[PDB]
Design a protein around this ligand. Structure first.
Ligand SMILES: N=C(N)NC[C@H]1Cc2cc(CN3CCC[C@@H]3CO)ccc2[C@@H]1NC(=O)C(=O)Nc1ccc(Cl)c(F)c1
Ligand SMILES: *[C@@H]1O[C@H](CO)[C@@H](O)[C@H](O)[C@H]1NC(C)=O
Ligand SMILES: *[C@@H]1O[C@H](CO)[C@@H](O)[C@H](O)[C@H]1NC(C)=O
Ligand SMILES: *[C@@H]1O[C@H](CO)[C@@H](O)[C@H](O)[C@H]1NC(C)=O
Ligand SMILES: *[C@@H]1O[C@H](CO)[C@@H](O)[C@H](O)[C@H]1NC(C)=O
Ligand SMILES: *[C@@H]1O[C@H](CO)[C@@H](O)[C@H](O)[C@H]1NC(C)=O
Ligand SMILES: *[C@@H]1O[C@H](CO)[C@@H](O)[C@H](O)[C@H]1NC(C)=O
Ligand SMILES: *[C@@H]1O[C@H](CO)[C@@H](O)[C@H](O)[C@H]1NC(C)=O
Ligand SMILES: *[C@@H]1O[C@H](CO)[C@@H](O)[C@H](O)[C@H]1NC(C)=O
Ligand SMILES: *[C@@H]1O[C@H](CO)[C@@H](O)[C@H](O)[C@H]1NC(C)=O
Length: 335
Protein backbone atom coordinates (compact mmCIF):
# COMPACT_ATOMS: atom_id res chain seq x y z
CA UNK A 1 0.00 0.00 0.00
CA UNK A 2 1.43 3.35 1.13
CA UNK A 3 2.79 5.06 4.22
CA UNK A 4 -0.02 6.81 6.04
CA UNK A 5 0.46 9.67 8.51
CA UNK A 6 -1.12 10.65 11.84
CA UNK A 7 -3.02 13.79 12.73
CA UNK A 8 -3.53 14.48 16.44
CA UNK A 9 -5.00 17.27 18.50
CA UNK A 10 -1.98 17.20 20.79
CA UNK A 11 -0.41 20.03 22.73
CA UNK A 12 3.30 20.87 22.59
CA UNK A 13 3.31 22.26 26.17
CA UNK A 14 1.94 18.97 27.63
CA UNK A 15 4.51 16.83 29.48
CA UNK A 16 2.26 13.84 28.89
CA UNK A 17 4.03 11.29 26.75
CA UNK A 18 1.34 10.62 24.14
CA UNK A 19 1.21 14.36 23.53
CA UNK A 20 4.98 14.62 23.16
CA UNK A 21 5.22 11.73 20.71
CA UNK A 22 2.32 13.02 18.65
CA UNK A 23 3.58 16.63 18.40
CA UNK A 24 6.88 15.03 17.39
CA UNK A 25 5.33 12.71 14.75
CA UNK A 26 1.78 13.81 13.89
CA UNK A 27 0.45 16.80 11.98
CA UNK A 28 -2.46 18.83 13.39
CA UNK A 29 -5.98 17.68 12.66
CA UNK A 30 -8.11 19.36 10.04
CA UNK A 31 -11.06 21.05 11.82
CA UNK A 32 -13.02 20.90 8.54
CA UNK A 33 -14.01 17.23 7.95
CA UNK A 34 -13.46 16.29 4.33
CA UNK A 35 -16.06 13.51 3.74
CA UNK A 36 -17.74 11.99 0.65
CA UNK A 37 -20.84 9.76 0.69
CA UNK A 38 -21.64 7.20 -2.03
CA UNK A 39 -24.22 4.50 -1.06
CA UNK A 40 -24.13 1.97 -3.95
CA UNK A 41 -20.35 1.65 -4.28
CA UNK A 42 -20.02 -1.83 -2.70
CA UNK A 43 -16.42 -2.13 -1.61
CA UNK A 44 -15.21 -5.24 0.20
CA UNK A 45 -13.25 -4.97 3.46
CA UNK A 46 -11.37 -7.50 5.56
CA UNK A 47 -10.58 -6.09 9.01
CA UNK A 48 -8.37 -9.13 9.64
CA UNK A 49 -5.98 -8.38 6.79
CA UNK A 50 -5.59 -4.59 6.83
CA UNK A 51 -2.26 -2.83 6.43
CA UNK A 52 -3.62 0.13 8.43
CA UNK A 53 -3.52 -2.05 11.56
CA UNK A 54 0.14 -2.87 10.92
CA UNK A 55 1.09 0.79 10.47
CA UNK A 56 -0.66 1.82 13.67
CA UNK A 57 0.88 -1.07 15.58
CA UNK A 58 4.27 0.12 14.34
CA UNK A 59 3.59 3.64 15.57
CA UNK A 60 2.25 2.60 18.99
CA UNK A 61 5.34 0.43 19.50
CA UNK A 62 7.45 3.47 18.62
CA UNK A 63 5.50 5.64 21.03
CA UNK A 64 5.89 3.16 23.85
CA UNK A 65 9.65 2.68 23.39
CA UNK A 66 10.04 6.46 23.34
CA UNK A 67 7.76 7.22 26.33
CA UNK A 68 7.48 4.23 28.67
CA UNK A 69 11.13 3.24 28.89
CA UNK A 70 11.79 0.25 31.19
CA UNK A 71 14.61 0.24 33.75
CA UNK A 72 15.60 -3.07 32.22
CA UNK A 73 14.60 -4.83 29.02
CA UNK A 74 15.48 -8.48 28.50
CA UNK A 75 15.10 -9.67 24.98
CA UNK A 76 16.87 -12.67 23.63
CA UNK A 77 20.07 -12.93 25.61
CA UNK A 78 20.53 -9.16 25.87
CA UNK A 79 19.64 -6.90 28.79
CA UNK A 80 19.42 -3.18 27.93
CA UNK A 81 19.22 -0.69 30.85
CA UNK A 82 17.75 2.82 30.51
CA UNK A 83 16.59 5.56 32.76
CA UNK A 84 13.00 4.60 33.64
CA UNK A 85 11.52 7.77 35.16
CA UNK A 86 7.89 7.95 36.14
CA UNK A 87 5.88 9.91 33.59
CA UNK A 88 2.53 11.53 32.81
CA UNK A 89 0.64 8.89 30.80
CA UNK A 90 -2.89 9.36 29.38
CA UNK A 91 -3.64 7.97 25.90
CA UNK A 92 -4.84 10.67 23.51
CA UNK A 93 -6.86 10.01 20.33
CA UNK A 94 -4.87 9.61 17.08
CA UNK A 95 -6.16 9.92 13.52
CA UNK A 96 -4.68 7.94 10.64
CA UNK A 97 -4.71 9.86 7.34
CA UNK A 98 -4.07 8.89 3.69
CA UNK A 99 -1.45 10.90 1.76
CA UNK A 100 -2.02 12.71 -1.54
CA UNK A 101 -3.20 10.33 -4.29
CA UNK A 102 -4.76 7.86 -1.81
CA UNK A 103 -7.99 8.01 0.19
CA UNK A 104 -9.58 6.05 3.04
CA UNK A 105 -12.84 4.25 2.39
CA UNK A 106 -15.15 3.97 5.40
CA UNK A 107 -17.86 1.36 5.79
CA UNK A 108 -21.17 2.81 6.98
CA UNK A 109 -23.18 -0.36 7.67
CA UNK A 110 -23.96 0.22 11.34
CA UNK A 111 -24.05 -3.62 11.63
CA UNK A 112 -20.99 -4.45 9.43
CA UNK A 113 -19.19 -7.44 10.92
CA UNK A 114 -15.95 -6.14 9.40
CA UNK A 115 -15.41 -8.72 6.67
CA UNK A 116 -17.15 -8.87 3.33
CA UNK A 117 -19.09 -6.47 1.13
CA UNK A 118 -20.31 -3.16 2.48
CA UNK A 119 -23.11 -1.16 0.85
CA UNK A 120 -23.04 2.43 2.16
CA UNK A 121 -19.41 3.61 1.71
CA UNK A 122 -17.66 6.96 2.21
CA UNK A 123 -14.44 8.74 1.22
CA UNK A 124 -12.40 10.34 3.98
CA UNK A 125 -9.04 11.97 4.56
CA UNK A 126 -8.66 10.40 8.04
CA UNK A 127 -10.02 7.83 10.45
CA UNK A 128 -11.80 8.99 13.54
CA UNK A 129 -9.80 9.73 16.65
CA UNK A 130 -8.42 6.48 18.05
CA UNK A 131 -6.94 6.15 21.52
CA UNK A 132 -4.20 3.50 21.40
CA UNK A 133 -5.25 1.73 24.62
CA UNK A 134 -3.13 -1.37 25.29
CA UNK A 135 -4.98 -4.08 27.20
CA UNK A 136 -6.11 -7.70 27.32
CA UNK A 137 -9.53 -9.32 27.88
CA UNK A 138 -11.39 -5.99 28.14
CA UNK A 139 -11.16 -3.40 25.35
CA UNK A 140 -11.14 0.03 27.01
CA UNK A 141 -12.11 3.58 26.02
CA UNK A 142 -13.02 2.41 22.53
CA UNK A 143 -15.91 3.64 20.40
CA UNK A 144 -19.31 1.98 20.90
CA UNK A 145 -21.32 0.25 18.28
CA UNK A 146 -24.14 2.21 16.82
CA UNK A 147 -27.16 -0.05 16.56
CA UNK A 148 -26.79 -3.52 18.00
CA UNK A 149 -23.89 -5.56 19.37
CA UNK A 150 -21.52 -6.84 16.66
CA UNK A 151 -19.40 -9.98 16.75
CA UNK A 152 -16.19 -9.98 14.73
CA UNK A 153 -13.96 -12.91 13.99
CA UNK A 154 -11.63 -13.94 11.22
CA UNK A 155 -13.34 -17.37 11.38
CA UNK A 156 -15.83 -18.51 14.02
CA UNK A 157 -15.41 -22.20 13.28
CA UNK A 158 -11.69 -21.93 14.03
CA UNK A 159 -11.58 -21.68 17.78
CA UNK A 160 -8.02 -20.37 17.63
CA UNK A 161 -9.22 -17.14 16.03
CA UNK A 162 -9.67 -14.37 18.62
CA UNK A 163 -13.26 -13.12 18.83
CA UNK A 164 -13.97 -9.41 19.24
CA UNK A 165 -17.25 -8.41 20.82
CA UNK A 166 -18.12 -4.81 19.84
CA UNK A 167 -20.54 -3.53 22.51
CA UNK A 168 -23.17 -0.86 21.88
CA UNK A 169 -23.43 0.24 25.48
CA UNK A 170 -20.38 1.24 27.49
CA UNK A 171 -19.88 -0.45 30.91
CA UNK A 172 -18.10 1.40 33.69
CA UNK A 173 -14.95 -0.08 35.18
CA UNK A 174 -13.19 1.90 37.90
CA UNK A 175 -9.74 0.76 39.03
CA UNK A 176 -7.90 2.21 42.00
CA UNK A 177 -4.77 1.65 44.04
CA UNK A 178 -5.74 3.74 47.07
CA UNK A 179 -3.62 6.25 48.95
CA UNK A 180 0.58 -3.52 50.33
CA UNK A 181 1.69 -0.68 48.05
CA UNK A 182 0.96 -3.01 45.08
CA UNK A 183 -2.70 -3.88 45.81
CA UNK A 184 -5.64 -2.33 43.97
CA UNK A 185 -9.18 -3.19 42.97
CA UNK A 186 -11.72 -2.62 40.22
CA UNK A 187 -15.46 -2.00 40.59
CA UNK A 188 -18.19 -2.81 38.06
CA UNK A 189 -21.97 -2.47 38.35
CA UNK A 190 -23.18 -6.10 38.46
CA UNK A 191 -26.57 -5.09 37.01
CA UNK A 192 -24.82 -3.42 34.08
CA UNK A 193 -22.50 -6.38 33.57
CA UNK A 194 -25.56 -8.65 33.91
CA UNK A 195 -27.38 -7.06 31.08
CA UNK A 196 -24.29 -6.92 28.90
CA UNK A 197 -23.33 -10.57 29.13
CA UNK A 198 -26.95 -11.63 28.68
CA UNK A 199 -27.20 -9.62 25.47
CA UNK A 200 -23.83 -10.91 24.40
CA UNK A 201 -24.87 -14.49 24.89
CA UNK A 202 -27.93 -13.84 22.84
CA UNK A 203 -25.88 -12.65 19.90
CA UNK A 204 -23.37 -15.45 20.47
CA UNK A 205 -26.27 -17.95 20.32
CA UNK A 206 -27.26 -16.65 16.88
CA UNK A 207 -23.88 -18.09 15.81
CA UNK A 208 -24.15 -21.37 17.78
CA UNK A 209 -27.87 -22.12 18.11
CA UNK A 210 -28.43 -25.59 19.64
CA UNK A 211 -25.69 -24.92 22.24
CA UNK A 212 -25.87 -23.31 25.67
CA UNK A 213 -23.47 -20.37 26.11
CA UNK A 214 -20.84 -20.34 28.86
CA UNK A 215 -18.49 -17.63 30.23
CA UNK A 216 -15.50 -18.94 32.19
CA UNK A 217 -12.34 -17.22 33.44
CA UNK A 218 -9.16 -17.41 31.40
CA UNK A 219 -7.71 -20.94 31.53
CA UNK A 220 -3.95 -20.42 31.27
CA UNK A 221 -1.15 -18.29 29.98
CA UNK A 222 1.23 -15.56 30.94
CA UNK A 223 -0.23 -13.44 33.72
CA UNK A 224 -0.65 -10.62 31.20
CA UNK A 225 -3.49 -12.47 29.39
CA UNK A 226 -4.98 -14.62 32.13
CA UNK A 227 -5.91 -11.37 33.85
CA UNK A 228 -7.28 -8.09 32.55
CA UNK A 229 -4.02 -6.14 32.19
CA UNK A 230 -3.45 -2.56 31.20
CA UNK A 231 -1.51 0.59 31.95
CA UNK A 232 -3.06 3.27 34.09
CA UNK A 233 -1.36 6.58 34.83
CA UNK A 234 1.93 4.76 34.33
CA UNK A 235 1.60 1.64 36.41
CA UNK A 236 0.79 -1.83 35.02
CA UNK A 237 -2.42 -3.17 36.52
CA UNK A 238 -3.23 -6.86 36.43
CA UNK A 239 -6.80 -7.56 37.50
CA UNK A 240 -8.35 -10.97 38.17
CA UNK A 241 -11.47 -11.50 36.07
CA UNK A 242 -12.85 -14.78 37.43
CA UNK A 243 -15.69 -12.97 39.16
CA UNK A 244 -16.58 -11.53 35.77
CA UNK A 245 -16.20 -14.03 32.95
CA UNK A 246 -18.20 -16.49 35.06
CA UNK A 247 -21.80 -17.20 34.08
CA UNK A 248 -24.18 -19.31 32.02
CA UNK A 249 -26.68 -18.42 29.29
CA UNK A 250 -29.40 -21.00 28.58
CA UNK A 251 -33.00 -20.71 27.36
CA UNK A 252 -32.82 -17.01 26.58
CA UNK A 253 -31.74 -16.23 30.17
CA UNK A 254 -28.34 -15.27 31.55
CA UNK A 255 -27.28 -16.33 35.06
CA UNK A 256 -24.17 -14.71 36.46
CA UNK A 257 -22.06 -17.34 38.25
CA UNK A 258 -19.38 -15.00 39.62
CA UNK A 259 -19.43 -13.56 43.14
CA UNK A 260 -20.67 -10.01 43.77
CA UNK A 261 -21.43 -7.88 46.85
CA UNK A 262 -23.90 -5.03 47.23
CA UNK A 263 -24.46 -5.34 43.52
CA UNK A 264 -20.92 -4.57 42.37
CA UNK A 265 -18.16 -6.92 41.28
CA UNK A 266 -14.73 -6.00 42.57
CA UNK A 267 -11.58 -7.39 41.00
CA UNK A 268 -8.39 -7.88 42.95
CA UNK A 269 -5.46 -6.37 41.03
CA UNK A 270 -1.75 -6.26 41.56
CA UNK A 271 0.67 -3.67 40.15
CA UNK A 272 3.52 -5.61 38.55
CA UNK A 273 7.11 -4.49 38.01
CA UNK A 274 8.20 -7.32 35.70
CA UNK A 275 6.23 -7.30 32.50
CA UNK A 276 5.86 -9.68 29.58
CA UNK A 277 6.13 -7.30 26.64
CA UNK A 278 3.36 -7.12 24.04
CA UNK A 279 5.59 -5.48 21.47
CA UNK A 280 8.03 -8.38 21.03
CA UNK A 281 8.89 -11.58 22.91
CA UNK A 282 10.75 -10.38 25.99
CA UNK A 283 10.52 -8.76 29.39
CA UNK A 284 10.53 -5.23 30.73
CA UNK A 285 11.29 -4.23 34.31
CA UNK A 286 9.92 -0.95 35.67
CA UNK A 287 10.32 1.06 38.83
CA UNK A 288 8.17 0.56 41.95
CA UNK A 289 4.78 2.29 41.83
CA UNK A 290 4.50 6.08 42.22
CA UNK A 291 2.65 7.20 45.33
CA UNK A 292 -0.76 8.45 46.16
CA UNK A 293 -4.05 7.18 44.84
CA UNK A 294 -3.74 5.77 41.31
CA UNK A 295 -7.14 5.68 39.61
CA UNK A 296 -8.44 5.01 36.11
CA UNK A 297 -12.16 5.40 35.44
CA UNK A 298 -12.63 3.75 32.05
CA UNK A 299 -15.36 2.49 29.71
CA UNK A 300 -15.48 -1.17 28.86
CA UNK A 301 -16.52 -0.86 25.19
CA UNK A 302 -15.52 -4.33 23.94
CA UNK A 303 -14.48 -7.87 24.73
CA UNK A 304 -11.68 -10.19 23.56
CA UNK A 305 -12.95 -13.79 23.84
CA UNK A 306 -11.70 -17.22 22.75
CA UNK A 307 -13.94 -20.28 22.48
CA UNK A 308 -12.92 -23.91 23.14
CA UNK A 309 -23.95 -29.43 23.63
CA UNK A 310 -22.11 -26.50 25.25
CA UNK A 311 -19.94 -23.77 23.75
CA UNK A 312 -17.91 -21.78 26.28
CA UNK A 313 -15.92 -18.55 25.88
CA UNK A 314 -13.10 -17.18 28.05
CA UNK A 315 -11.33 -13.83 28.00
CA UNK A 316 -8.24 -13.66 25.80
CA UNK A 317 -5.91 -11.21 24.09
CA UNK A 318 -2.18 -10.66 23.83
CA UNK A 319 -1.86 -9.58 20.18
CA UNK A 320 -2.23 -5.84 20.68
CA UNK A 321 -3.11 -5.61 16.98
CA UNK A 322 -6.59 -6.88 17.80
CA UNK A 323 -7.22 -3.68 19.76
CA UNK A 324 -6.30 -1.61 16.73
CA UNK A 325 -8.43 -3.89 14.50
CA UNK A 326 -11.46 -3.34 16.72
CA UNK A 327 -11.35 0.39 15.90
CA UNK A 328 -9.98 0.26 12.35
CA UNK A 329 -12.26 -2.59 11.27
CA UNK A 330 -14.29 -0.21 9.16
CA UNK A 331 -11.70 1.27 6.88
CA UNK A 332 -9.41 0.52 3.97
CA UNK A 333 -6.99 2.69 1.98
CA UNK A 334 -7.40 2.93 -1.78
CA UNK A 335 -5.96 4.18 -5.11
N1 LIG B 1 6.48 -11.54 25.94
C1 LIG B 1 5.63 -12.24 24.95
N2 LIG B 1 5.46 -13.50 24.96
N3 LIG B 1 4.96 -11.45 23.93
C2 LIG B 1 4.13 -12.13 22.96
C3 LIG B 1 2.82 -11.37 22.92
C4 LIG B 1 2.07 -11.75 21.67
C5 LIG B 1 0.93 -12.68 22.13
C6 LIG B 1 0.01 -13.46 21.41
C7 LIG B 1 -0.94 -14.24 22.08
C8 LIG B 1 -1.92 -15.05 21.23
N4 LIG B 1 -1.78 -16.22 21.41
C9 LIG B 1 -2.90 -16.96 20.69
C10 LIG B 1 -2.27 -17.45 19.35
C11 LIG B 1 -1.07 -17.03 19.32
C12 LIG B 1 -0.67 -16.62 20.86
C13 LIG B 1 -0.13 -17.79 21.71
O1 LIG B 1 -0.27 -17.36 23.03
C14 LIG B 1 -1.01 -14.27 23.49
C15 LIG B 1 -0.09 -13.49 24.20
C16 LIG B 1 0.88 -12.72 23.51
C17 LIG B 1 1.95 -11.81 24.05
N5 LIG B 1 1.29 -10.64 24.53
C18 LIG B 1 1.83 -10.17 25.78
O2 LIG B 1 2.73 -10.77 26.26
C19 LIG B 1 1.18 -8.92 26.42
O3 LIG B 1 0.26 -8.43 25.82
N6 LIG B 1 1.70 -8.38 27.70
C20 LIG B 1 1.09 -7.15 28.19
C21 LIG B 1 1.93 -6.17 28.70
C22 LIG B 1 1.41 -4.95 29.15
C23 LIG B 1 0.06 -4.72 29.02
CL1 LIG B 1 -0.67 -3.17 29.57
C24 LIG B 1 -0.76 -5.69 28.46
F1 LIG B 1 -2.10 -5.46 28.33
C25 LIG B 1 -0.26 -6.90 28.03
C1 LIG C 1 -19.30 -11.62 8.38
O1 LIG C 1 -20.20 -11.07 7.42
C2 LIG C 1 -20.01 -11.55 6.08
C3 LIG C 1 -20.99 -10.80 5.22
O2 LIG C 1 -20.91 -9.40 5.48
C4 LIG C 1 -20.18 -13.07 6.05
O3 LIG C 1 -19.86 -13.57 4.76
C5 LIG C 1 -19.26 -13.73 7.06
O4 LIG C 1 -19.47 -15.14 7.07
C6 LIG C 1 -19.50 -13.14 8.45
N1 LIG C 1 -18.63 -13.75 9.43
C7 LIG C 1 -18.80 -13.61 10.76
C8 LIG C 1 -17.80 -14.33 11.63
O5 LIG C 1 -19.71 -12.93 11.24
C1 LIG D 1 -27.63 -3.42 21.61
O1 LIG D 1 -27.58 -4.82 21.17
C2 LIG D 1 -28.50 -5.67 21.88
C3 LIG D 1 -28.32 -7.09 21.35
O2 LIG D 1 -27.60 -7.13 20.12
C4 LIG D 1 -29.95 -5.15 21.80
O3 LIG D 1 -30.79 -5.93 22.64
C5 LIG D 1 -30.03 -3.69 22.21
O4 LIG D 1 -31.35 -3.19 22.03
C6 LIG D 1 -29.03 -2.89 21.38
N1 LIG D 1 -29.12 -1.46 21.63
C7 LIG D 1 -29.02 -0.89 22.84
C8 LIG D 1 -28.85 -1.83 24.00
O5 LIG D 1 -29.06 0.33 22.98
C1 LIG E 1 -12.77 -21.74 9.28
O1 LIG E 1 -11.93 -22.87 9.54
C2 LIG E 1 -12.53 -24.13 9.20
C3 LIG E 1 -11.60 -25.20 9.72
O2 LIG E 1 -11.31 -25.00 11.10
C4 LIG E 1 -12.75 -24.17 7.70
O3 LIG E 1 -13.28 -25.44 7.33
C5 LIG E 1 -13.71 -23.05 7.33
O4 LIG E 1 -13.92 -22.99 5.92
C6 LIG E 1 -13.14 -21.70 7.78
N1 LIG E 1 -14.10 -20.64 7.53
C7 LIG E 1 -13.94 -19.72 6.57
C8 LIG E 1 -15.02 -18.66 6.50
O5 LIG E 1 -12.98 -19.73 5.80
C1 LIG F 1 -7.90 -15.32 40.32
O1 LIG F 1 -8.65 -15.73 41.52
C2 LIG F 1 -8.89 -17.15 41.60
C3 LIG F 1 -9.67 -17.39 42.87
O2 LIG F 1 -9.63 -16.24 43.70
C4 LIG F 1 -7.57 -17.93 41.56
O3 LIG F 1 -7.83 -19.33 41.60
C5 LIG F 1 -6.82 -17.56 40.28
O4 LIG F 1 -5.60 -18.28 40.14
C6 LIG F 1 -6.57 -16.07 40.27
N1 LIG F 1 -5.75 -15.69 39.13
C7 LIG F 1 -4.80 -14.75 39.19
C8 LIG F 1 -4.02 -14.53 37.92
O5 LIG F 1 -4.59 -14.08 40.22
C1 LIG G 1 -17.15 -18.33 39.67
O1 LIG G 1 -16.94 -17.64 40.96
C2 LIG G 1 -16.91 -18.48 42.12
C3 LIG G 1 -16.64 -17.59 43.31
O2 LIG G 1 -16.87 -16.23 43.02
C4 LIG G 1 -15.86 -19.57 41.97
O3 LIG G 1 -15.98 -20.46 43.07
C5 LIG G 1 -16.09 -20.35 40.69
O4 LIG G 1 -15.09 -21.34 40.52
C6 LIG G 1 -16.09 -19.41 39.49
N1 LIG G 1 -16.30 -20.16 38.27
C7 LIG G 1 -15.29 -20.61 37.53
C8 LIG G 1 -15.66 -21.41 36.32
O5 LIG G 1 -14.11 -20.35 37.81
C1 LIG H 1 -25.58 0.50 39.57
O1 LIG H 1 -25.50 -0.38 40.74
C2 LIG H 1 -26.47 -0.14 41.78
C3 LIG H 1 -26.21 -1.18 42.86
O2 LIG H 1 -24.94 -1.82 42.72
C4 LIG H 1 -27.89 -0.21 41.22
O3 LIG H 1 -28.81 0.14 42.25
C5 LIG H 1 -28.04 0.74 40.03
O4 LIG H 1 -29.35 0.64 39.48
C6 LIG H 1 -27.00 0.43 38.96
N1 LIG H 1 -27.15 1.33 37.82
C7 LIG H 1 -27.98 1.09 36.78
C8 LIG H 1 -28.00 2.14 35.70
O5 LIG H 1 -28.67 0.08 36.72
C1 LIG I 1 -28.39 -8.57 38.10
O1 LIG I 1 -27.74 -8.05 39.28
C2 LIG I 1 -28.66 -8.03 40.38
C3 LIG I 1 -28.01 -7.27 41.52
O2 LIG I 1 -26.63 -7.01 41.30
C4 LIG I 1 -29.04 -9.45 40.75
O3 LIG I 1 -30.04 -9.34 41.76
C5 LIG I 1 -29.56 -10.25 39.55
O4 LIG I 1 -29.55 -11.64 39.86
C6 LIG I 1 -28.70 -10.05 38.30
N1 LIG I 1 -29.38 -10.58 37.12
C7 LIG I 1 -29.05 -11.73 36.51
C8 LIG I 1 -29.88 -12.10 35.32
O5 LIG I 1 -28.12 -12.44 36.91
C1 LIG J 1 -10.13 6.06 29.79
O1 LIG J 1 -10.49 7.41 29.60
C2 LIG J 1 -10.64 8.21 30.78
C3 LIG J 1 -10.93 9.60 30.28
O2 LIG J 1 -9.93 10.03 29.37
C4 LIG J 1 -9.37 8.17 31.62
O3 LIG J 1 -9.69 8.74 32.88
C5 LIG J 1 -8.89 6.74 31.84
O4 LIG J 1 -7.59 6.76 32.42
C6 LIG J 1 -8.81 5.98 30.52
N1 LIG J 1 -8.41 4.61 30.75
C7 LIG J 1 -7.33 4.08 30.17
C8 LIG J 1 -7.03 2.65 30.52
O5 LIG J 1 -6.64 4.72 29.37
C1 LIG K 1 -17.84 6.61 28.66
O1 LIG K 1 -18.99 6.61 27.79
C2 LIG K 1 -19.76 7.83 27.84
C3 LIG K 1 -21.02 7.59 27.04
O2 LIG K 1 -20.76 6.87 25.85
C4 LIG K 1 -18.90 8.97 27.29
O3 LIG K 1 -19.67 10.17 27.24
C5 LIG K 1 -17.66 9.13 28.17
O4 LIG K 1 -16.80 10.09 27.56
C6 LIG K 1 -16.90 7.79 28.30
N1 LIG K 1 -15.81 7.91 29.27
C7 LIG K 1 -15.96 7.86 30.61
C8 LIG K 1 -14.70 7.96 31.42
O5 LIG K 1 -17.06 7.73 31.14
Amino acid sequence: KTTLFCASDAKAYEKEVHNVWATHACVPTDPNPQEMVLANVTENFNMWKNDMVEQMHEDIISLWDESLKPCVKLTGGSAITQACPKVSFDPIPLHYCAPAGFAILKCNNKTFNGTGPCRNVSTVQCTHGIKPVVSTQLLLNGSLAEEEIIIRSENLTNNAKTIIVHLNESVNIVCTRPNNIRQAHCNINESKWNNTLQKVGEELAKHFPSKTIKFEPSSGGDLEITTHSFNCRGEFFYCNTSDLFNGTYRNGTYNHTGRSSNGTITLQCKIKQIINMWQEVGRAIYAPPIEGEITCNSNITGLLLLRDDTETFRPGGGDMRDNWRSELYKYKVVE
